[PDB]
Amino acid sequence: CHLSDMLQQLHSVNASKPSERGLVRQEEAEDPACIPIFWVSKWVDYSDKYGLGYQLCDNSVGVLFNDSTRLILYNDGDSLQYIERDGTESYLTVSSHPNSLMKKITLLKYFRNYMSEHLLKAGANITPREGDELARLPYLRTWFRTRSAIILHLSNGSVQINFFQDHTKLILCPLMAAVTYIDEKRDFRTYRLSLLEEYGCCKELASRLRYARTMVDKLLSSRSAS
């Protein structure tokens, strides 16, 4: 799918060695038109038992259960989307659901309740955009963690990388061919990758883009499915 494009885009920028030029003009590479629509604002790793719960920046919630199924609660607080292993989607609500989804919906509720009361919203300083709140939300396609980061791949092709130690974050989009970098002060800049090639960037962002490439490679080498 789009991961192949993302890998192209990252290799291209990394190959240009953006931090090794005479004058870095990183600001020239910012493009506000590329600001992402969605990113993960909160997450809870309960995967030893149930799965990975997350909140998107639009206050919608989702769970990727250990059996590779998914529940998405829209930000209206009732509308539900269930995704089976093969990707089959069905629509329903918390108030009206098959009894068969009782347990999973209860789990969703607990995740929702927890991320409603606890934790800071990543990207809180970026504008809530007026849009169709029921327009199809992306869901968490897959995820994994390393010692250094959690890697989140969304069904809209975006890859998010949150670094544990310094709390910096990347939001990569292969459609916009852009990266959003959230730094240690929670400053939020969105860059077109091709312009990072043109103008370069600081060594800190350059290092993270190198890591990002490695992570996308992992996603590609383990995409599996049936």
Partner: peptide
């Protein structure tokens, strides 16, 4: 085990 969870975000910030």
């Amino acid at each position: 085990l969870h975000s910030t």
